[PDB]
Design a protein around this motif. Structure first.
Motif, PDB file in Angstrom:
ATOM      1  N   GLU A  14     -38.522 -95.603 -12.689  1.00 35.99           N
ATOM      2  CA  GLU A  14     -37.599 -94.595 -13.152  1.00 35.99           C
ATOM      3  C   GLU A  14     -36.279 -94.700 -12.914  1.00 35.99           C
ATOM      4  OE1 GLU A  14     -37.629 -90.734 -10.728  1.00 35.99           O
ATOM      5  OE2 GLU A  14     -38.811 -89.803 -12.511  1.00 35.99           O
ATOM      6  N   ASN A  15     -35.176 -94.479 -13.662  1.00 31.15           N
ATOM      7  CA  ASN A  15     -34.124 -94.928 -13.789  1.00 31.15           C
ATOM      8  C   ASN A  15     -33.128 -94.389 -14.796  1.00 31.15           C
ATOM      9  OD1 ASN A  15     -31.818 -96.269 -12.482  1.00 31.15           O
ATOM     10  ND2 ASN A  15     -32.135 -98.167 -13.218  1.00 31.15           N
ATOM     11  N   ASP A  16     -32.136 -93.374 -14.791  1.00 27.53           N
ATOM     12  CA  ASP A  16     -32.055 -92.745 -13.338  1.00 27.53           C
ATOM     13  C   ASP A  16     -32.008 -91.327 -13.672  1.00 27.53           C
ATOM     14  OD1 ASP A  16     -30.821 -91.445 -11.154  1.00 27.53           O
ATOM     15  OD2 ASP A  16     -28.970 -92.852 -11.075  1.00 27.53           O
ATOM     16  N   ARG A  17     -33.139 -90.816 -12.862  1.00 25.71           N
ATOM     17  CA  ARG A  17     -33.332 -89.204 -13.019  1.00 25.71           C
ATOM     18  C   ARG A  17     -32.124 -88.338 -13.260  1.00 25.71           C
ATOM     19  NH1 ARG A  17     -38.545 -87.047 -11.415  1.00 25.71           N
ATOM     20  NH2 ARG A  17     -38.692 -84.691 -11.788  1.00 25.71           N
ATOM     21  N   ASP A  18     -30.958 -88.654 -12.314  1.00 27.34           N
ATOM     22  CA  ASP A  18     -29.862 -87.740 -12.356  1.00 27.34           C
ATOM     23  C   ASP A  18     -28.749 -88.326 -12.889  1.00 27.34           C
ATOM     24  OD1 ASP A  18     -28.413 -89.473 -10.394  1.00 27.34           O
ATOM     25  OD2 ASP A  18     -29.725 -88.996  -8.903  1.00 27.34           O
ATOM     26  N   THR A  24     -33.937 -92.884  -8.366  1.00 27.46           N
ATOM     27  CA  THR A  24     -34.549 -94.019  -8.900  1.00 27.46           C
ATOM     28  C   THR A  24     -35.994 -94.309  -8.370  1.00 27.46           C
ATOM     29  OG1 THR A  24     -33.453 -95.354  -7.696  1.00 27.46           O
ATOM     30  CG2 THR A  24     -32.481 -94.951  -9.757  1.00 27.46           C
ATOM     31  N   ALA A 297     -39.532 -89.260 -20.980  1.00 32.60           N
ATOM     32  CA  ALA A 297     -38.447 -89.324 -19.959  1.00 32.60           C
ATOM     33  C   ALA A 297     -37.694 -87.701 -19.769  1.00 32.60           C
ATOM     34  CB  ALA A 297     -37.761 -90.022 -20.627  1.00 32.60           C
ATOM     35  N   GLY A 342     -36.906 -83.479 -17.242  1.00 28.30           N
ATOM     36  CA  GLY A 342     -37.122 -84.830 -16.377  1.00 28.30           C
ATOM     37  C   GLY A 342     -35.932 -85.259 -15.926  1.00 28.30           C
ATOM     38  N   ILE A 343     -34.785 -84.476 -16.268  1.00 37.60           N
ATOM     39  CA  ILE A 343     -33.650 -84.902 -15.994  1.00 37.60           C
ATOM     40  C   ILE A 343     -32.906 -83.834 -14.910  1.00 37.60           C
ATOM     41  CG2 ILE A 343     -30.980 -85.136 -16.686  1.00 37.60           C
ATOM     42  CD1 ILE A 343     -33.027 -87.501 -17.424  1.00 37.60           C
ATOM     43  N   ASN A 344     -32.218 -84.408 -13.910  1.00 32.76           N
ATOM     44  CA  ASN A 344     -31.760 -83.524 -12.712  1.00 32.76           C
ATOM     45  C   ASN A 344     -30.221 -83.590 -12.766  1.00 32.76           C
ATOM     46  OD1 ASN A 344     -34.532 -83.718 -12.130  1.00 32.76           O
ATOM     47  ND2 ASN A 344     -34.167 -82.542 -10.451  1.00 32.76           N
ATOM     48  N   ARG A 409     -37.831 -93.544 -17.962  1.00 31.27           N
ATOM     49  CA  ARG A 409     -38.956 -93.438 -17.173  1.00 31.27           C
ATOM     50  C   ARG A 409     -40.427 -94.417 -17.791  1.00 31.27           C
ATOM     51  NH1 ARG A 409     -38.967 -88.347 -16.854  1.00 31.27           N
ATOM     52  NH2 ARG A 409     -37.696 -88.255 -14.806  1.00 31.27           N
TER      53      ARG A 409
END
Ligand SMILES: CCCCCCC/C=C\CCCCCC(=O)OC[C@@H](O)CO
Ligand SMILES: CCCCCCC/C=C\CCCCCC(=O)OC[C@@H](O)CO
Ligand SMILES: CCCCCCC/C=C\CCCCCC(=O)OC[C@H](O)CO
Ligand SMILES: CCCCCCC/C=C\CCCCCC(=O)OC[C@H](O)CO
Ligand SMILES: CCCCCCC/C=C\CCCCCC(=O)OC[C@H](O)CO
Ligand SMILES: [Ca+2]
Length: 418
Positions: A14-18, A24, A297, A342-344, A409
């Motif tokens: 996972e890269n990159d949730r934020d 990650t 994702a 799934g994105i912060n 992701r």
């Protein structure tokens, strides 16, 4: 079969949730699920546990690196009527409907199911009391003291065509912090739904479709913040999801989807949300493998969100399947959040363009480990398998300057059953 053991090895990248904004995943793990089942006339009982060890805190099932858990534990009584698809289930259990947008989770519940050829019906109540996990001592605040009660009824009015209604009610019994020391609600979803082999990967029809419409009403006490006070307001929101799938041949399928959850209004009052029990995963691409309806994702919740979708899929007998899905997402109200993605990362005021996503799911199913369609573990894993699941998300203008231009992701799951 009175017992078994599911063994899964998972890697997650996972890269990159934020999107690079905050400080990650690249990891591997093992997941062991012993299970037990007994059946005696109209009675039965079931247990599944789980032991996990990983190099980091990865997702092995759609906290510490290692833990033990109780996944399911229930007793079931099927003797109220002679209909075999009718039974009453008590305990922590898998609740699921085909769209995945209302309920798809393991939760303590009492759930009545009645499934026959011409008429389906269900009714149940559910509430979380624990995570039943060695690493988590507490419930999520949203779940604490929240009770769910729900039901649906539907009929097959023509061969392969079902029409139905569905209701859900969530009641928060908790309290908010007093000033100086995020919400409580009473909410009702009332939905109609029409499907023509929507989630039947083995359809004999050249065209399949789903259409559903859901009205959300009730009220929310929103906490304002240290707490300073509370805002109450009625909620009056609306959600819709439509899709059409071309069954091109025995192997090739393709389709289009559209979904929208209303947004904004004074203090978020016209803001649709889902029940909180949904997974948003379904066989909408027409294969045995379930796909995240709003991207592996992005993982959107239908909330101030509009999505357009295109997909293609391929399968060969029961040996392989694959799906490729594109999504484009917009906000409905550009000054309100979308929630539960799934994105912060924060959105820029006044921008509707959330972004685009491309997904790929590919599975090979092995001969070993075949199950009856009765088990709750058959929807995700009908036998041993090896699966890649990946999503590529391209953030739009709503995320704005200094954010990564791309995020992904991806998962590989290898599963063997003894
Ligand atoms: C700590 C790093 C050890 C594990 C390294 C890589 C395993 C994850 C592979 C990504 C899974 C495929 C998506
Ligand atoms: C994407 C929508 C795909 C539609 C497929 C239509 C059938 C193609 C013609 C095949 C004969
Ligand atoms: C309040 C919820 C109650 C849920 C009960 C959870 C029970 C979980 C698993 C029970 C497993 C049942 C099979 C084991 C058993 O009872 O023995 C039967 C014999 O070994 C086989 O005939
Ligand atoms: C069983 C129907 C299958 C159709 C699947 C794809 C349908 C796609 C579009 C149907 C109508 C959707 C409206 C799209 C649109 O831009 O409307 C504007 C929004 O209402 C603005 O909020
Ligand atoms: C036939 C299409 C194949 C691709 C379909 C969906 C893509 C699935 C996984 C993408 C693999 C990883 C892509 C790497 C990438 O683009 O971003 C790298 C970093 O995540 C950027 O922050
Ligand atoms: Ca980061």
């Amino acid at each position: 079969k009175n017992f078994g053991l599911d063994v899964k090895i998972t890697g997650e990248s996972e890269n990159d949730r934020d999107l690079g904004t905050a400080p990650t995943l690249n990891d591997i793990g093992i997941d062991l699920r012993p299970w037990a089942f007994g059946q005696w006339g109209d009675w039965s009982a079931y247990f599944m546990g789980q032991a996990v060890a990983a190099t980091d805190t990865i997702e092995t099932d759609t906290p510490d690196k290692s833990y033990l858990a109780a996944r399911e534990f229930w007793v079931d009584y099927a003797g109220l009527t002679a209909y075999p698809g009718e039974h009453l289930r008590f305990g922590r259990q898998r609740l699921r409907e085909d769209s995945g947008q209302w309920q798809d989770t393991n939760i303590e519940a009492l759930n009545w199911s009645f499934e026959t050829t011409l008429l389906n019906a269900h009714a149940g109540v559910a509430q979380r009391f624990s995570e039943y996990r060695t690493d988590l001592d507490e419930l999520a605040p949203e779940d604490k003291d929240r009770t769910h009660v729900f039901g649906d009824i539907s009929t097959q009015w023509a061969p392969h065509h079902r029409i139905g209604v569905r209701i859900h009610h969530a009641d928060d019994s908790g309290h908010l912090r007093r000033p100086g020391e995020t919400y409580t609600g009473q909410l009702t979803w009332l939905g109609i739904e029409a499907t023509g082999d929507a989630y039947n990967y083995r359809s004999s029809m050249p065209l399949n479709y789903w259409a559903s419409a859901t009205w959300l009403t009730g009220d929310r006490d929103n906490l304002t913040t240290i707490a300073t006070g509370k805002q109450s307001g009625d909620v009056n929101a609306f959600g819709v999801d439509l899709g059409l799938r071309w069954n091109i041949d025995e192997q090739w399928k393709a389709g289009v989807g559209y979904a929208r959850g209303s947004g904004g209004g004074k203090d978020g009052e016209e803001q649709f949300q889902q029940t909180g029990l949904e997974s948003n995963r379904s066989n909408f691409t027409g294969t045995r493998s379930r796909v995240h309806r709003f991207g592996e994702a992005f993982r959107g919740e239908l909330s101030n969100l509009q999505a357009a979708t295109l997909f293609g899929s391929w399968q060969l007998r029961e040996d392989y399947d694959a799906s490729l899905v594109y999504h484009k997402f917009w906000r409905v109200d550009d000054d309100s959040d979308i929630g539960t993605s799934g994105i912060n990362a924060a959105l820029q005021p006044g921008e509707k363009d959330i972004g685009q996503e491309l997904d790929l799911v590919v599975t090979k199913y092995f001969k070993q480990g075949l199950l009856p369609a009765s088990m709750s573990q058959y929807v995700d894993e009908p036998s041993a398998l090896i699966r890649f699941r990946g999503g590529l998300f391209k953030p739009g203008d709503a995320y704005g300057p200094g954010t990564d231009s791309t995020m992904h992701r991806a998962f590989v799951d290898f599963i063997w059953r003894f």
